[PDB]
Amino acid sequence: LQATPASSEKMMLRLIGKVKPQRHMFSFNNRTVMDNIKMTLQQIISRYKDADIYEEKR
Amino acid sequence: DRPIDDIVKNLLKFVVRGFYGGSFVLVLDAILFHSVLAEDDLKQLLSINKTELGPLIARLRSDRLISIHKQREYPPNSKSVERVYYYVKYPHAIDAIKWKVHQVVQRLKDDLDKNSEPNGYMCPICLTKYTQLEAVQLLNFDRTEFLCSLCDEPLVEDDSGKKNKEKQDKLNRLMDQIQPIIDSLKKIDDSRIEENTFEIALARLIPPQNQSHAAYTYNPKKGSTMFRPGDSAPATLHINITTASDEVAQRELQERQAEEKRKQNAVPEWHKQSTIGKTALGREERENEKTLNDYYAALAKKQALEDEFEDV
Amino acid sequence: MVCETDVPSEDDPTQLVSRGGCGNTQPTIRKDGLKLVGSWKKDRDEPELRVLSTEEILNIFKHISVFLETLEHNGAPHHAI
Amino acid sequence: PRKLQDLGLKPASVDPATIKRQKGKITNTHMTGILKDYSHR
Amino acid sequence: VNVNLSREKILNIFENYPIVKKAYTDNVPKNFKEPEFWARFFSSKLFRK
Amino acid sequence: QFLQWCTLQPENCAVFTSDNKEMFQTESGLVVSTYSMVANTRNRSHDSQKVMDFLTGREWGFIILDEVHVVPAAMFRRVVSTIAAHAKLGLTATLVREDDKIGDLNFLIGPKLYEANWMELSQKGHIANVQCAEVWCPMTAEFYQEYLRETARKRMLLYIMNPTKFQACQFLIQYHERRGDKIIVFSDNVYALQEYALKMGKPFIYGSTPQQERMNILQNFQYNDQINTIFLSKVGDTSIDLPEATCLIQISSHYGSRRQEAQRLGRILRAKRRNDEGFNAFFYSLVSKDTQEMYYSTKRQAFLVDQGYAFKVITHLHGMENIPNLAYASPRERRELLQEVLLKN
DNA sequence: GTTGTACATA
DNA sequence: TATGTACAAC
Ligand SMILES: [Mg+2]
Ligand SMILES: [Zn+2]
Ligand SMILES: [Zn+2]
């Protein structure tokens, strides 16, 4: 989950697909909404990463 | 979103639809349905020209039901342009509504009080009214009628002696028609409403168009100490299931870790033994189980672009 | 050029005392024609310039602690006003 | 807002005026270019 | 934060809290795997209730 | 550490040092400073004179004197009379000093409340065990011939830079660096410190080093993998926390101070890996054979012996000849060093 | 960068 | 008393 630094005027957010990896990049209008969506997305991606790690365990 | 927003919007909707014309309903509802709305986008939504949108905005801005926000925009294709956005500042609009409602009620109350007082005589020729106290000093020698000081003409008694009941009905009519405003205000006072801003209003934006020229973003200048009037307002949880085999592995890892630490901690040679006489320091069971399994199976058978980014 | 919301205490140094203020940097007011144009010096590069509307000055002067209508009524973009 | 308070009506706003919007000499140089800045942990 | 679980502990959780078992049996084979359920359960308000 | 172990918010904490001098504006706060910034009387800067008045004016409730073995000095004791305080606490590992002023603490801050045995806490895993050693480096004939004729004030610099000590220090550093250890080298002589540092290309800290540089060096030595060892001086002889340090080497030392030896050994007594099985920190003291340094070395360790530490003599370093390169290995280099050092003499 | 002053030891 | 070294200030 790629997010632009808070020190930049842009509010762009990119999701990179796991493998020409699929990239879905969205630009927001308010930082508050951008942060709220980012936190929710991070939970899903992080949880899926843990699930994939467990699957790869065996 | 929140109960507070719904009640405030309803109060704004009621005031506009009742105390304003028709086009005002369209303009304010568009900027209530949406967040901060550009002037160009508003025109496209309502399909009205600038000459028709201007009068609506001006009257709504006078009553502080809509706020304006001007900022410079820098598009790569065209030269820098100034864009105008319209939104609603609930604290301002609600305060304006409360003041106007009180003033309207007070004005009718004052008119009713004034009407109940004795009427003041008026002169027909010069149309200069006179109160009872002022007319009493205009009495003539024969004391028949009040004579105007300027015209020297008899005074005529003024009207409004019969309206004593009409104004009471008018006040009754208003309070009945204005009841929803009072009821909504009571609930608003009970709660506390935060003041909105262009940036804050952008958190609830529903874009009107697909390729709107207005970049609906707030990019304030860096370290700009300039202030305009009315420009501001007041973890991860990772789980690890430990299988019986994993526990055995953990014990093996602990033993290996202990061995690694022990080797690193081995005392040097010179400290192990006391060196005093040395020179100067200078320079197959599987078939057994299978036959049992076959026998037990027989037993069972028998028995059965490049952009800066960071990683989040 | 600053409101000094907090000022050092006279009695004891290195002990700030809160005073009524808003800490807004003041402009370098200059008289352009018949209007007052204020220029602000950003902390961190041309200074910010805007026209001090008489309404803004009237409001400020009223806070200091005995002796056109047709246009603004309808339309009249900010440039016309 | 002040006028509304005078009449006993709670004002849902505030005056904007009330909005309070407010060493060089290095000793050792032979290690230059080797020390990474572990400023924080 | 890493929380270590065990098969014996998992069975104990089911015995002591029948509500946890109810949410486990009806979702583990249908919607998401067991590891996701426990990660969600700890972060939920039920684990706090 | 204060912001870590307790809940005192940063807004209530203020540090009074040569870099920054701002004081907390809260009703009650904390001030952490140094004696040098509180004991000066003659001339104080306009920015620091206000701080002293701020310290003196208020009636403080608690004063903590770290390393209280320096308060009974000629001038430092004035910190007890100027800064009013209801309760005074003194914290020090060694309560000894050469002069008889040690007893002055009785009427200054109070008596001795509690004392803990060094070995008792060592066997309980609270502080790391140490295998102290004293390496005897035989001075070469070329240098020793000048050690006799020269005067006392110039002898110190002469037996501190003997080539054999360089070889011993280099060998020990290489051996422990291969062992994955963090080494600290102490030297009371600044000239020897710089010479050793430049020869081995390792950082050094002493009086002239600015606060920012030394703080950066210490942080790097703690977290940076490349920086395995650092050279310290009398400045870091006490009150510096280096949890990653596990080995200490001495090439120079003050004349006869037993306190300095104990304080230097303290740098490694707090090693992080002080509980893993078989761990043993080290404390090397490189001395010159048949020199006046041996007189002080047997006198400089009279306090550690009392606590229970045992010093053993190392007459030879095994595997030291097989090292590929050693400093001053050829007579040409040794003669050059003798001419270079004698120039300063 | 330098000068006036302590502390710790012969 | 002399001599190193470290420290604060100008
Ligand atoms: Mg300490
Ligand atoms: Zn008349
Ligand atoms: Zn101000």
DSSP structure string for F147-170: HHHS-HHHHHHHHSS-HHHHHHHH
Query: Which nucleotide minimizes the distance between its C1' and the CA of F19?
Result: H8
Closest residue in chain E to residue A54, using alpha carbons only: E35
Compute the residue count for chain D: 41
Categorise residue F291: left if φ over 0, alpha if ψ from -120 to 50, beta otherwise. Answer: beta
The secondary element (H helix, E strand) that includes residue B77 is: none
Burial (CB < 10 A; 0-12, 13-18, 19+), residue A22, is exposed
Categorise residue F176: left if φ over 0, alpha if ψ from -120 to 50, beta otherwise. Answer: alpha
Q: From the list B54, B223, B228, which residue is nearest C42 (CB)?
A: B223
- Please check whether residue B65 is in contact with residue B96, taking contact to mean a CB–CB distance below 8 angstroms: yes
Categorise residue F141: left if φ over 0, alpha if ψ from -120 to 50, beta otherwise. Answer: alpha
CA distance D24 to chain F (A): 8
Nearest-Å Rg of the Cα atoms of chain F is 22
Token pair recorded at residue B227: 């202030």
Token pair recorded at residue D19: 């909005």
The CA A7 to ligand 3 mean position distance, Å, reads 29
The residues with which C16 forms a beta bridge, in sequence order, are: C8
Amino acid B240 reads: N
Token pair recorded at residue A38: 């980012």
Residue B196 and residue B202: Cα distance in Å, rounded?
10
Resolution, Å (one decimal): 3.6
Q: Which of residues 186-245 of F touch strand H (CB under 7 A)?
A: 188-191, 206-208, 233-235
For Cα atoms F318, F322, F326, give the angle at the middle one, nearest 5 degrees: 100
Residue C18 and residue C31: Cα distance in Å, rounded?
33
The CA F240 to ligand 1 mean position distance, Å, reads 7
Residues 6+ apart with CB under 8 A from A11: A4, A27, A28, A29, A30, A31, A34, B217
The CA F91 to ligand 1 mean position distance, Å, reads 8
Task: State the CB neighbour count (10 A cutoff) for residue F326.
Answer: 19
Gaps in chain B with C–N over 2.5 Å, residue before each: 234, 283, 304
Q: In D1-17, which positions are buried (b, 16+ CB within 10 angstroms) versus exposed (e)?
A: beebeeeebebbbeebe
Chain D positions in Cβ-Cβ contact with residue B91 (cut-off 8 Å): 12-14
The secondary element (H helix, E strand) that includes residue B85 is: strand B81-87
Token pair recorded at residue F209: 């080093």
Residue F178 and residue F181: Cα distance in Å, rounded?
8
Strands A23-27 and A12-16: antiparallel
CB-based contact, A7 to chain B, within 8 Å? no
Collapsed DSSP state (helix, strand, coil) of residue A53: helix
Known binding residues of C for Zn(2+) are 3, 22
CA atom of F153 to C1′ atom of H1, Å? 15
The verdict on a CB contact (< 8 Å) between F226 and D34 is yes
- In this structure, what DSSP letter does residue F137 have? E
- Positive/negative CA dihedral, F187, F190, F195, F201: positive
The residues with which B85 forms a beta bridge, in sequence order, are: B38, B69
CA distance A53 to chain B (A): 10
Burial (CB < 10 A; 0-12, 13-18, 19+), residue A5, is exposed
Number of H helices, E strands in chain B: 12, 5
Query: In Å, what is the CA distance from A1 to each residue of B310, F175, F301?
Result: 8, 46, 60
Task: State the CB neighbour count (10 A cutoff) for residue B160.
Answer: 15
| Spatial CA neighbour of B196 closest among B66, B53, B40 | B66
Query: In Å, what is the CA distance from B240 to each residue of A57, E10, E34, F93, F224?
Result: 11, 12, 11, 45, 31
Amino acid B99 reads: W
Nearest-Å Rg of the Cα atoms of chain D is 29
DSSP structure string for E1-49: -EEEEEHHHHHHHHHH-HHHHHHHHTTTTTTS-HHHHHHHHHHSSTTT-
Chains meeting D at 3+ CB pairs closer than 8 A?
A: B, C, F
Starting at the edge strand found earlier in the chain, the sheet holding C35-40 runs: C28-32, C35-40, C48-51
State how far Cα B26 lies from the chain centre.
20
Token pair recorded at residue F156: 């110190």
Residues 6+ apart with CB under 8 A from B198: B36, B69, B71, B85, B87, B218
| Spatial CA neighbour of F128 closest among F119, F138, F117 | F119
Collapsed DSSP state (helix, strand, coil) of residue F313: strand
Strands A23-27 and B37-38: unpaired
The verdict on a CB contact (< 8 Å) between C3 and D22 is yes
| Spatial CA neighbour of B283 closest among F156, F334, F338 | F334
Token pair recorded at residue E36: 């996701």
| Spatial CA neighbour of E38 closest among C37, D27, E46, B125 | E46
Residues 6+ apart with CB under 8 A from B204: B1, B35
Residue E32 and residue F51: Cα distance in Å, rounded?
64
**Alpha carbon distance, N-terminus to C-terminus of chain E:** 20
The CA F260 to ligand 1 mean position distance, Å, reads 14
The residues with which A23 forms a beta bridge, in sequence order, are: A16
Chain F positions in Cβ-Cβ contact with residue D41 (cut-off 8 Å): 223
Token pair recorded at residue F92: 């020090």
Instruction: Give the residue whose CA sits closest to G9 at C1'.
Output: F255
Residue F95 and residue F114: Cα distance in Å, rounded?
12
Instruction: Give the residue whose CA sits closest to H6 at C1'.
Output: F207
State how far Cα E35 lies from the chain centre.
8
Burial (CB < 10 A; 0-12, 13-18, 19+), residue C34, is exposed
CA torsion C12-C15-C16-C17 (nearest 10°) is -60
CA atom of F196 to C1′ atom of G3, Å? 30
Is F42's CB less than 7 Å from nucleic acid strand H? no
Strands F130-137 and F85-91: unpaired
How was this model experimentally determined? Answer: cryo-EM
| Spatial CA neighbour of D17 closest among B90, C40, C22, C23 | C22
DSSP structure string for F50-116: HHHHHHHHS-EEEEEEESGGGTTSTTGGGHHHHS-EEEEEEE-S----SSSGGGGGGGTT-------
DSSP structure string for B233-294: -----EEEEE-HHHHHHHHHHHHHHHHHHHHHTPPPHHHHS---SS--S---HHHHHHHHHH
The residues with which F134 forms a beta bridge, in sequence order, are: F285, F313
The residues with which F131 forms a beta bridge, in sequence order, are: F282
Collapsed DSSP state (helix, strand, coil) of residue B146: strand
The residues with which F15 forms a beta bridge, in sequence order, are: F32
Nearest-Å Rg of the Cα atoms of chain B is 44
Nearest-Å Rg of the Cα atoms of chain A is 14
| Spatial CA neighbour of F194 closest among F140, F148, F143, F157 | F157
CA distance F273 to chain C (A): 44
- Please check whether residue F163 is in contact with residue F143, taking contact to mean a CB–CB distance below 8 angstroms: yes
CA atom of B218 to C1′ atom of G3, Å? 58
Chain E positions in Cβ-Cβ contact with residue A50 (cut-off 8 Å): 35-36, 39
In 3-state terms, chain A is what percent helix, strand and coil (to 5)? Answer: 45, 20, 35
- Please check whether residue F338 is in contact with residue F143, taking contact to mean a CB–CB distance below 8 angstroms: yes
Residue B171 and residue F101: Cα distance in Å, rounded?
97
Chain F positions in Cβ-Cβ contact with residue D27 (cut-off 8 Å): 204-206, 208-210, 213
Chains meeting F at 3+ CB pairs closer than 8 A?
A: B, C, D
Token pair recorded at residue B295: 């026998």
- Please check whether residue C48 is in contact with residue B224, taking contact to mean a CB–CB distance below 8 angstroms: yes
| Spatial CA neighbour of F222 closest among F192, F197, F194, F242 | F242
- Please check whether residue B94 is in contact with residue B11, taking contact to mean a CB–CB distance below 8 angstroms: yes
Residue B227 and residue F133: Cα distance in Å, rounded?
71
**Protein contacts of strand G with Cβ less than 7 Å away:** D 25; F 39, 41-42, 69-70, 73-76, 97-99, 152, 254-257, 259-260, 296
The secondary element (H helix, E strand) that includes residue F192 is: helix F190-200
- Please check whether residue B102 is in contact with residue D9, taking contact to mean a CB–CB distance below 8 angstroms: yes
Chain G footprint positions (protein CB, under 7 Å): 1, 4-10
Q: Which of residues 239-298 of F touch strand H (CB under 7 A)?
A: none
Token pair recorded at residue F196: 């050793």
- Please check whether residue B153 is in contact with residue B145, taking contact to mean a CB–CB distance below 8 angstroms: no
- Please check whether residue C78 is in contact with residue C67, taking contact to mean a CB–CB distance below 8 angstroms: no
Residue F146 and residue F148: Cα distance in Å, rounded?
5
CA atom of F73 to C1′ atom of G6, Å? 9
The dihedrals phi and psi of F132, each to the nearest 5 degrees, come to -65, 150
What ligand is nearest to the CA atom of residue C22?
Answer: 3
Task: State the CB neighbour count (10 A cutoff) for residue F55.
Answer: 19
Number of H helices, E strands in chain D: 1, 0
The dihedrals phi and psi of F116, each to the nearest 5 degrees, come to -115, 140
